[PDB]
Symmetry: C3
Subunit: 377 residues, 3 copies
């Protein structure tokens, strides 16, 4: 059976009988008729709804944490994948792989109707990137989020605030290793590592970048992938955050992201070399410093450079201290937040130090990234 049809031009002056259907041969679609409206009512090609992703509540993430190792996709979620509609009319359990402390996972909605997580961010095992659509993810943390203001524990579990989907996520290109702070913005769970080019800025159990162990030079600003910065100046850490679509925190962001840590407490000992791990000679375990949002080593471990200036100024004369990129005049200090291991009761979620100019590079200053919260219709 071949239906009556014609071009779009031929349809423009044609009024079909009520409930008559024709085919527009220019568009390769069906046109429904009502006995009254010239041109009828063309229907949409599936191609024009490719990547559709519809949630019942667009103001919240698409998933719910249901236990330390379990999560569900929410009722009312509709997903286009591989030419098909896949929907969930009730909260539906996500099939989990083996979960390993300090690892990010991607959540996929597949064309067989299943929803599943995997450590692989291209495709889950058993599927391809065609039959399985990445719609979100989460961080399986090495310990709990802070229930109050005494840090968390060392029981590996899903961080509820690290749940993201394609329309509810970090603005930064790579959403991995980040957590949503009070619903307002995203923070890196871990302090910046030396090998951030391959690891991203936020990775568990890696060597922390600071004034002595400088980060690798950004490949967007002349770096070759191997060379590190000559030192850990503010300029270099800011440049690295920019590379990854992030920034250093301001004071309002820092107090928010670090809330839940054990206040007026520092790591002790002589160093904090590694993310998510006890410091060298530490008197407090790493988990003492976990925030409400699951930010790890949120205070009392390393200072983070901030994206704010103020406090004491440098000399009122042109000073070439920017790594060969011009001079500064009356340069104010760049903020440092959080305290570090040797600062005893001065560390905390509002600890702030404004004496150090941006060219300074001591062993107890590193960085933590933040970015905007991206919500989409």
């Amino acid at each position: 059976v071949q239906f009556r049809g014609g071009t779009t031009a031929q349809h423009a002056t044609f009024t079909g009988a009520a409930r008559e259907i024709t085919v527009d041969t220019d568009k390769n679609t069906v046109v429904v008729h009502d006995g009254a409206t010239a041109g009828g009512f063309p229907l949409a090609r599936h191609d024009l709804v490719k990547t559709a992703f519809i949630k019942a509540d667009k103001s919240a993430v698409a998933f719910t944490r249901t236990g330390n190792a379990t999560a569900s996709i929410k009722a009312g979620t509709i997903v286009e994948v591989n030419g098909k509609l896949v929907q969930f009319t009730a909260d539906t359990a996500i099939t989990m792989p083996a979960l390993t402390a300090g690892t990010d996972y991607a959540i996929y909605v597949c064309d067989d109707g299943t929803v599943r997580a995997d450590s692989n961010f291209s495709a889950p095992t058993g599927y391809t990137s065609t039959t399985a659509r990445k719609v979100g993810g989460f961080h399986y943390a090495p310990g709990s989020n802070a229930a109050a203001q005494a840090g968390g524990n060392t029981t590996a579990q899903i961080n509820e605030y690290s749940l993201w989907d394609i329309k509810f996520r970090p603005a930064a290109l790579d959403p991995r290793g980040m957590t949503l702070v009070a619903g307002a913005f995203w923070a890196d769970i871990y302090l910046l590592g030396v090998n951030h080019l391959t690891d991203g800025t936020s990775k568990y159990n890696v060597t922390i970048a600071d004034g002595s162990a400088s980060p690798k030079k950004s490949t967007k600003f002349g770096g070759d992938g191997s060379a590190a910065y000559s030192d850990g100046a503010w300029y270099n850490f800011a440049e690295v955050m920019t590379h990854h679509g992030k920034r250093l925190p301001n004071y309002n962001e820092f107090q928010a992201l670090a809330f839940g840590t054990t206040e007026a407490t520092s790591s002790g000992g002589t160093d904090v070399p590694t993310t998510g791990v006890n410091g060298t000679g530490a008197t407090s375990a790493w988990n003492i410093f976990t925030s409400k949002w699951g930010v790890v080593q949120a205070s009392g471990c390393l200072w983070t450079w901030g994206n704010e200036f103020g406090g004491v100024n440098g000399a009122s004369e042109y000073t070439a201290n920017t790594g060969g990129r011009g001079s500064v005049y009356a340069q104010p200090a760049a903020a440092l937040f959080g305290g570090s291991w040797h600062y005893t009761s001065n560390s905390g979620s509002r600890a702030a130090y404004w004496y150090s100019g941006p060219s300074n590079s001591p062993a107890n200053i590193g960085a933590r990234g933040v970015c905007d919260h991206l919500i989409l219709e």
Copy 2:
């Protein structure tokens, strides 16, 4: 009549005659054929266009203010609601309820083809949240926006700049009580109130939060809903804004949002206890301080904490003044903007004071929230 059909796999090697239609039984959709293309041309299921919202001009809000108490939805607006297409081919009047000074309203497009406003943000009277879709809203202000730089009047009316829709709105979760400043960002119409947890940050005729009447403690940062902060330090006001997905203004934002106020003028008297209402012993009525964008008490009433640091510094020694969350060193002042009631000709849209550290808490400092402008395709 049952059409020829089969699975998606069976369709992959099938080329129907030109204008033949088949049914894909995996997808439950129609496939159109052209006599040439194997697989044909699948059509889209309605489920995959749920929540569609299309405007002729996505760079502007979907509505036009047509009078003090009237507004229309713009021509070319197409809305999916309850499985149906509802569109407007000309500017179409919004059915209004009784309008009450200092109240927010939601605009709904309903499946019977009507567009209507209501004080209820779940559903308009006569409808449910299924048959009526919330697409936007506005603030019915207690007075006019400033036509020049002498404030506004006390004639209750729709604030044109407070019009928002789901793809043209404050980035903050709750869009109510906000206005778009020069098309650039949104500002709270009213100064922060004590009861912001229930009222939101921007509400007419409520008790203003300041250094003596501290805001309720944020429930995202340890608050129980009843307890207030011990004082009105910068830290506490910043924390409240974060709770609501907002922030304190910087200097560029403040001069923009306050433009239109009566410059070099203060409220006078001894206090400004309440939003949108005359101050205690005031020599100027509240409306003298309305900005071009309808920001109420924009200057000369209470200072707002700003999200900027600079000016005079605190001691260059560790000082525990953050409410038990660590120490500050060489802490710069946090900006204050706008002036307050006792500052005579020093108040204005560019009034700025940089002597007060963030731990200060006097009766003449409160806060105003701002957030980004969210525009979506």
Copy 3:
């Protein structure tokens, strides 16, 4: 042939045979049936996918620069235009007009299946705004982007980083004359001009706005389109950026956008009056100062006001120096970035000067705009 049909209510209790199609006369759409599901499966009206724009990689712009004067639209791009689906299954060449140095172009996908650029931002020649859909654009620069840290050349060509589309673009209303810096945010290619109301903030070969040649007064803040500001104070430049949905850069943004310029080098001579053109008596041609991202006169030409405060403070007393909009107390300096023509080896991508209060207005300070990167699903 008229198909069986009825209202949506009549459909609710109707289960058609498998592969039966009916027409919902309320919706004017087709409903597919499966012999089991009451109500069947309504299909989507084309109206509900109007403006659909789907890319294979939503994290990147839709176009690729293939030469100095050529570009293609990427494979997998699907576009709704004039009721039709237009797609590209391979990278497809964009038809170019004559290209003129320092000019912005719009890219259109047309309903005849072609993709083409034009200097006109309403419609390309030969088409209307109905048959041709603006989907993006680019800047044809007067010289190359910096390949290293020695600026660029004077060979006119497409700036790859200036490529934008409707879902990958400056957050500012007008995307023209901007470039994406390290994938993080957008910067104005050119310094702010006097005639920014008609030209936008970023235009080639126009008179630069500075402390002597003040910008035209913003028409959103009392300007009439002809009057200029009394001087070039920080306040005025910030106000102009706000008008255009932009802001002055902070330090982290500035070092990023200016990277690639010839460091520790200034224009020389006595002035830099014009964008994209040699300075008056310059010892370095304009192209010496082109950044990696194609930011023109990025350093060593004019200082830009920054959106940051710090450094040396003004008197600790109320000072009416805001153009009649209140007084400032202990006002910190507003940052200046980049250096200017007379600053020899002190200029560069990290050059910063913090001695000048915002009310200052010398001939060697202007402004450059930045804004957020807008990525959409």
